[PDB]
Design a protein around this ligand. Structure first.
Ligand code: NW1
Length: 290
C-alpha cells in the first residue's frame, strides 16, 4: 500500500471500502478495493488472466499483513449513478441496447471460461465516456463468498438474485448472471428496480407476483428444491407489456427469455447475442457529468 496515494473513498462495495487511488511511481489512477486463506488467493490470482473489454481489469492483487487489496482499472461512473442522473429523462433506448449487448459479451466470455459473477447489480457495472460498459467484481463471490452484510454492514442487495439461488439450489450456474442482467435491463428501461425485495421471502414473492408462482409445469424439479414450500401463494403471471411497457416486442421477448424460471432453458449470453433485438445495435456515447 505504500505505492499508493488514496484520493478519495469512492464508496462501499460488497467486500469493503473502494478507494480512488494514484500509483506513486507511474501516476496511474486506479480503484483500490480493501477486502487470506490460500484458496481465495489462488482463485483471485486466476482472475488476473480473465481479460475482456467489457470486464473491469483486475490489475493487481496486493496481500500485506493478512490484508488483501484488489487493484482494478478505474472507470468514471457506475451505472446506478448514471441511471440516477438519467432519471427525469431515462437512458436512451439505443444506449440501453448497446449496454446490454456489451454486458452480454462480457458474460459470454467469462461464462466460456466457467467463471460466474453471482452478484451483478448496477453498482458493479461501470461506464466510461466512450460508450463502453464493463462488469466489476467478476468471479469474486466464488473466490471469497458474498456476505449477507458488507464491511459497513450495508445490506447486501437481493434485487438481482436468480430464483434458483433464493430457492436453495447449491450448484447454480452461469444462468444466474443472465437473470441478474435481465433485471438490470428492465430497470434501465423503466427507471425503477424490477424486483426490489427487502428480504429473501419478499424477493421471491415479488418475483412470483410478476412472473407467476413457478411450478412443475414451467420449472421441472422446482418443487423439490430445498427452500421451495408447497404453501407458497400461487400467483398468476403478468404480461411483459405491463412489466417494461416502453420496450418493443423484440426487447420484451429477449427479456422474457433472460427471466425464464428454469435455469436450463434461460437464454445463454452467447445465444442472447444473436437475438433479433440486437440487429440494429449501435454504440452511442453517454452524456456524462464527471
Ligand atoms: N471508478 C471506478 N472504477 C472501478 N473499477 C470501480 N469498481 O471496480 C468503481 O466502483 C465504484 C462503485 C463501487 C461500489 C459502490 C458504488 C461506487 N469505480
Amino acid at each position: 500500500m505504500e505505492n499508493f496515494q488514496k484520493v478519495e473513498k469512492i464508496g462501499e462495495g460488497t467486500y469493503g471500502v473502494v478507494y480512488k487511488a494514484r500509483n506513486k511511481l507511474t501516476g496511474e489512477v486506479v480503484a483500490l478495493k480493501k477486502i487470506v486463506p490460500s484458496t481465495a488467493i489462488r482463485e483471485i490470482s486466476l482472475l488476473k488472466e480473465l481479460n475482456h473489454p467489457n470486464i473491469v481489469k483486475l490489475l493487481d492483487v496486493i496481500h500485506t499483513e493478512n490484508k488483501l487489496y484488489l487493484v482494478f482499472e478505474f472507470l468514471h461512473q457506475d451505472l446506478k449513478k448514471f441511471m440516477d442522473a438519467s432519471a427525469l429523462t431515462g437512458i436512451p433506448l439505443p444506449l440501453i441496447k448497446s449496454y446490454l449487448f456489451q454486458l452480454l459479451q462480457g458474460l459470454a466470455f467469462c461464462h466460456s471460461h466457467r467463471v460466474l459473477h453471482r452478484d451483478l447489480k448496477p453498482q458493479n457495472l461501470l461506464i466510461n465516456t466512450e460508450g463502453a460498459i464493463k462488469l466489476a467484481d467478476f468471479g469474486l463471490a466464488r473466490a471469497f463468498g458474498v456476505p449477507v452484510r458488507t464491511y459497513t454492514h450495508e445490506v447486501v442487495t437481493l434485487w438481482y438474485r436468480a430464483p434458483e439461488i433464493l430457492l436453495g439450489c447449491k450448484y447454480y450456474s452461469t444462468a444466474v448472471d443472465i437473470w441478474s442482467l435481465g433485471c438490470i435491463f428492465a430497470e434501465m428501461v423503466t427507471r425503477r428496480a424490477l424486483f426490489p425485495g427487502d428480504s429473501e421471502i419478499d424477493q421471491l414473492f415479488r418475483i412470483f407476483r410478476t412472473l407467476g408462482t413457478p411450478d412443475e409445469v414451467v420449472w421441472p424439479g422446482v418443487t423439490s428444491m430445498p427452500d421451495y414450500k408447497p404453501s407458497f401463494p400461487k400467483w398468476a403471471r403478468q404480461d411483459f407489456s405491463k412489466v417494461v411497457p416502453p420496450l418493443d416486442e423484440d426487447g420484451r421477448s429477449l427479456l422474457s427469455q433472460m427471466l425464464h424460471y428454469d435455469p436450463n432453458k434461460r437464454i445463454s449470453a452467447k445465444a442472447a447475442l444473436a437475438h433479433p433485438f440486437f440487429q440494429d445495435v449501435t454504440k452511442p456515447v453517454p452524456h456524462l457529468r464527471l
